[PDB]
């Protein structure tokens, strides 16, 4: 018989995924995360297995994929995705629980930007890696490791690019992703979905929102902001595309940058990155590589 799912024992329910159910399992005595899909969710499971098996994808700031497998319990078939387990869970959970130091904030932001720069970068060669855009970047889709660094997860909605032809591996549907984090051009449907660079630029807007969530939690002299999602002050908890479009596209609002962020160099650098991710024109936004470079210089200094 098989040698992956057969040997894993589910221990604790972690929660529901966009598709499937997430569990903490034990494999060869180690904790692993297991996402289980039903037979009717095969397309979602297969596509996420396909993205995670991309050549040369592995990176310290991308969730470590172990295997895809099937498990027949005697009544129905389960479709499994097994990955590394991170006890802290999501960056969203971590930021709700804790405040971070200046060093802590920089570690979280630089590791997120390093993972995004790796996802976005094409690596040439026989064992080359295509450029990939996430399409659903948010604090609930980033995990925090024991060492206080992040890894990007939930790659199931990603798209991959073939650079020689400037084509995308799937026929992308409009407005996939979490509405709160959708870029202005995604919200108003002006995005050119035949242009792969458009998807990278939309991910940068969302990373800007995540950086704002982290910076609120940076405590200096015991001073910090409470945890909030971006746009908590302007839209309902589960907002519609129309609610988001009216705020982001028509009123042209972005999350507020508190005055106290001007009194600290690390917070000034973070606030400037946010503004340069939030431009309505995707072509004016910073690239993930440029952000990684700015933050590497900040972690050093």
Swiss-Prot record:
Key words, A-Z: Aortic aneurysm, Apoptosis, ATP-binding, Cell junction, Cell membrane, Craniosynostosis, Differentiation, Disease variant, Disulfide bond, Glycoprotein, Growth regulation, Isopeptide bond, Kinase, Magnesium, Manganese, Membrane, Metal-binding, Nucleotide-binding, Phosphoprotein, Receptor, Serine/threonine-protein kinase, Signal, Tight junction, Transferase, Transmembrane, Transmembrane helix, Ubl conjugation
CC per GO annotation: activin receptor complex; bicellular tight junction; cell surface; cilium; endosome; membrane; membrane raft; nucleoplasm
Modified how: Phosphorylated at basal levels in the absence of ligand. Activated upon phosphorylation by TGFBR2, mainly in the GS domain. Phosphorylation in the GS domain abrogates FKBP1A-binding. N-Glycosylated.
Keyword Kinase part of the UniProt annotation: yes
Function: Transmembrane serine/threonine kinase forming with the TGF-beta type II serine/threonine kinase receptor, TGFBR2, the non-promiscuous receptor for the TGF-beta cytokines TGFB1, TGFB2 and TGFB3. Transduces the TGFB1, TGFB2 and TGFB3 signal from the cell surface to the cytoplasm and is thus regulating a plethora of physiological and pathological processes including cell cycle arrest in epithelial and hematopoietic cells, control of mesenchymal cell proliferation and differentiation, wound healing, extracellular matrix production, immunosuppression and carcinogenesis.
Regulation: Kept in an inactive conformation by FKBP1A preventing receptor activation in absence of ligand. CD109 is another inhibitor of the receptor.
GO biological process: activin receptor signaling pathway; angiogenesis involved in coronary vascular morphogenesis; anterior/posterior pattern specification; apoptotic process; artery morphogenesis; blastocyst development; cardiac epithelial to mesenchymal transition; cell motility
Cofactor(s) the protein requires to work: Mg(2+); Mn(2+)
Membrane topology of this protein: Single-pass type I membrane protein
Subunit structure: Homodimer; in the endoplasmic reticulum but also at the cell membrane. Heterohexamer; TGFB1, TGFB2 and TGFB3 homodimeric ligands assemble a functional receptor composed of two TGFBR1 and TGFBR2 heterodimers to form a ligand-receptor heterohexamer. The respective affinity of TGBRB1 and TGFBR2 for the ligands may modulate the kinetics of assembly of the receptor and may explain the different biological activities of TGFB1, TGFB2 and TGFB3.
EC class name: transferase
Residue positions of the active site: 136
GO molecular function: activin binding; activin receptor activity, type I; ATP binding; I-SMAD binding; metal ion binding; protein kinase activity; protein serine/threonine kinase activity; SMAD binding
Topological region Cytoplasmic: 3-301
Family classification: Belongs to the protein kinase superfamily. TKL Ser/Thr protein kinase family. TGFB receptor subfamily.
EC number, as in UniProt: 2.7.11.30
Impact after mutating residue 70 to H: In a patient with Marfan syndrome
Cross-link (Glycyl lysine isopeptide (Lys-Gly) (interchain with G-Cter in SUMO)): 194
Recorded consequence of changing residue 7 to V: Reduced phosphorylation. Reduced response to TGF-beta
Stated name of the protein: TGF-beta receptor type-1
Positions that bind ATP: 14-22, 35
Location(s), subcellular: Cell membrane; Cell junction, Tight junction; Cell surface; Membrane raft
Impact reported for residue 7 to D: Constitutive activation
Tissues and organs where the protein is expressed, per its UniProt entry: Found in all tissues examined, most abundant in placenta and least abundant in brain and heart. Expressed in a variety of cancer cell lines.
Major subcellular site: membrane
